[PDB]
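To assess whether the prediction recovers the assembly geometry, we first specified each molecular entity separately, as shown.
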Amino acid sequence: LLGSYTEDNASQARVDAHRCIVRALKDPNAFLFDHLLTLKPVKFLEGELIHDLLTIFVSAKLASYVKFYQNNKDFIDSLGLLHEQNMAKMRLLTFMGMAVENKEISFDTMQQELQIGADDVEAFVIDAVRTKMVYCKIDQTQRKVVVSXXXXXXXXXXXXXXXXXXXXXXXXXXXX
Amino acid sequence: MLLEIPYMAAHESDARRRMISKQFHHQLRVGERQPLLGPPESMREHVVAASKAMKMGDWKTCHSFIINEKMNGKVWDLFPEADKVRTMLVRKIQEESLRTYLFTYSSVYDSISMETLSDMFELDLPTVHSIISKMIINEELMASLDQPTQTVVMHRXXXXXXXXXXXXXXXXXXXXXXXXX
Amino acid sequence: KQVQIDGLVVLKIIKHYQEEGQGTEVVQGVLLGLVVEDRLEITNCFPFPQHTEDDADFDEVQYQMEMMRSLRHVNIDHLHVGWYQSTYYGSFVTRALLDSQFSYQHAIEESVVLIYDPIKTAQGSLSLKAYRLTPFEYMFEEVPIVIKNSHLINVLMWELEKKXXXXXXX
Amino acid sequence: GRVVRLHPVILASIVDSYERRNEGAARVIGTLLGTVDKHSVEVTNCFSVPHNESEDEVAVDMEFAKNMYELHKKVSPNELILGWYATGHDITEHSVLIHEYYSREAPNPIHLTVDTSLQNGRMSIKAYVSTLMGVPGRTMGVMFTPLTVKYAYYDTERIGVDLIMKTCFXXXXXXXXXXXXXXXXXXXXXXXXXXXXXXXXXXXXXXXXXXXXXXXXXXXXXXXXXXXXXXX
Amino acid sequence: AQQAFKFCLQYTRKAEFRKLCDNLRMHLSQIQRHHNQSTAINLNNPESQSMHLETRLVQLDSAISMELWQEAFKAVEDIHGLFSLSKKPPKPQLMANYYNKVSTVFWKSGNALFHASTLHRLYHLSREMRKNLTQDEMQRMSTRVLLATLSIPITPERTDIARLLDMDGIIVEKQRRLATLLGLQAPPTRIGLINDMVRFNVLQYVVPEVKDLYNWLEVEFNPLKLCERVTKVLNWVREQPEKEPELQQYVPQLQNNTILRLLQQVSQIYQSIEFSRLTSLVPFVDAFQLERAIVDAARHCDLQVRIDHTSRTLSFGXXXXXXXXXXXXXXXXXXXXXXXXXXXXXXXXXX
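The predicted structure of the complete assembly is given in tokenized form:
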């Protein structure tokens, strides 16, 4: 999807970039926005709202949106119903930010960042978009979630390691 | 019914401490294999419904059904003391249904509450604790009761079971030796 | 591109072709398996009955449906990944065989045509090939076929002249 | 009958049948074809059957037997329905009763056990026909007679096998893994019910000294434990 | 025969009625034997059959009125076997009465799929007659039909189990022949039956509240809002004279379906939820009846639970073991997703 969006951004009129940004930030499979934000067309000052959205979806949390809602189309999102798809994504991205800092996340911290009920909290963790993004074990008794371009680089390294691991397992089986 | 139901249930439990036979058991089996299941009309069907109700742990339903089977039958109306026996049977059925419940549901329940159970079966705790403890001790059930907090525990032992199996095997071997001789 | 042929698939195709050869009537059947990546696994086959009709229209959809349903009660439950035939003419003698393949390709564009020669197949030489149609150009091309066998199958095969979880993980 | 020969194709067909399901615990069942009209039974082909076992009872699809056999006959009438096979690795308690079913299609029924796990190198196959020695002063009792086996091939297959051994000379699997994980997340209750079953088998044997039934139960329990270990 | 049956109904002679029925069976068995013999009644002739079929139809009717349900069920197949042999169609009057009887039998039988089928057969037949008909009835009947289909016990079958054993249910249903007996090609699922409910004609005459209910439960079911939706929808049904009447008799099974769904969804949402919260989350007649339902859902394998009465908590799975195999089951799902994703990526590559 990043490929398709970058190709479109680098062929379409600059007037189409705002809509492209709304499309990106609403897309069910997209969680990484750095490459799109870095596009020279993306960079331009005039699409200030678009730039703000990129900062918001590339770098910020749900809290950052709330802080800036009067200067971003939160109201427009409400009119549209676009935001909930966007709201969901920003909350998912917030979990990703938290997981980067710590591989054990207390429920109380998540709820504040989450701005959602603790009972609901697990459901939100439960939802599949979250599951693909994260693999973790919920500990109800301890009230925590154990969750073991820049990001892509790190991911790549992991993938390589993963492959090596799988190979080991396969090798063993082959032996038997 | 009163005699063979809890022992059946336990067998459903599979603890299999003891084997018991209950009259009209064959009739119940026939009904289960029946293509058609009607709401009870003949008396044996009312008794039947009371049995299944005991199995699922609705004692109120069971008590209701006996009258319903009975009313067409007029079976309980033929006794002068019928009220007395109605309440007496209501009590004995309360007890045995409590037993049956415990037998069937101990799989998914690791722990229990004697207060709640007492209220809901309409059986005072002195009866509850007694029945449960007695039964557990008699059937060698891996169940533990704290009288202080009034709570029960199950779902366990492995090591002991294996020990038993070993014994049995040894017995079989001995038998074979006899034939060999 | 590679067609991986299983032990039972290869033995059934050689057996059927040879049985067909005694008959003097050309033998065809269906190949069952999995399209994996580009590559295709042929895990099993079954024979189609001899028909008066030659080449296309040979297939009997009532026989096929019955056979497929009864196999499904059987474990394998594998897509039809193509067809095999034994055809004497070489090399690439007959136009008619290709059209059959076009019918298979229209049902599933990944379909493969295997051809085996039961007369020229001799100890040390199996004469077999696998084809697809091309998408002044030639109409078709051939992809080399490899054989897949499990360790259990290898041990089993070794009884001639004797003097599951793992597969899943893989 | 004095002996049995089995074609390599049959061995590979039984393994392929077992392989597709991907169940270690499960034992697969099918039909064997060939020629049993002499003292040497020749087993030359086979096909899989839908088969399920519940408790002692097992279901075989009679219509499947008839319908598949009818197609087999259209391919090659020389390969007659001569018995059945299963993946074993050992005789099971229900086998004499299952064998009585196959008797309807043909007699005497022949049972080929193909050990698709291949624990023993020498034999991938055990062959049995049902017969009773009998007891004097008593009614005869049915039992399986063990017949010697060899693996033999016609020229076509010999050529094929030699060619195959030249170089020597996933979603379903994931689902199975998930099922194993579920079993693990439950095994404390299944342990206690396999402990009881084990005891039951012992009881049966005692009675015999029924015995067969008990033995089967014990075997089942052991199998269930082995499958739990493999999963782990 | 007609006179004899009227006698049995009028004087509640149930014992004799059963014997009457058996006599009629023996008589009919004889005719096939009789037919080879000279002077035998001709079961080939339409008038002869129409009379025989007319009798059996009445046999079913009296059976229902005498509440002899087992006898009713036997007489239904008696009727069925004659209809197959039957060339001339029955009077639609007497035929619609027949179907209206099947709905009662099957409600008492606890076979809800057959119940709804019989309703539909009657509706399709009552639409034609009268040629001019009340719209107020079409309102209530269509609603009834639809409600009875939502109210049907869940037909869902586990995916893991089915592939390995193709096993669902107890499983056993001795009234299985009857589905073939109603010209149904095979036993249906509740989802399947519902689609006919889904179809506009059932929908068009169908009270709106039921369409909403279907949305709330079958389309977009969310536990965090279902209780509210139901609370606002349940008032409307009670007020209506006809809707309430249709509704009154399906309250139980409907409630069962809804609660079953709530237990499943809670099983998905939680790992170990408090007994107070779980019971609180889903409405119940009584706190203990809610526990009963939860266990029943567990026995029928719609959910696996371990209920710890000491701490008042429920777990939808020794402790570390249950966490290990939950982790494994999560990892597996994750792998599956990744695999599927990779497939999608392949397509993107071409782009």
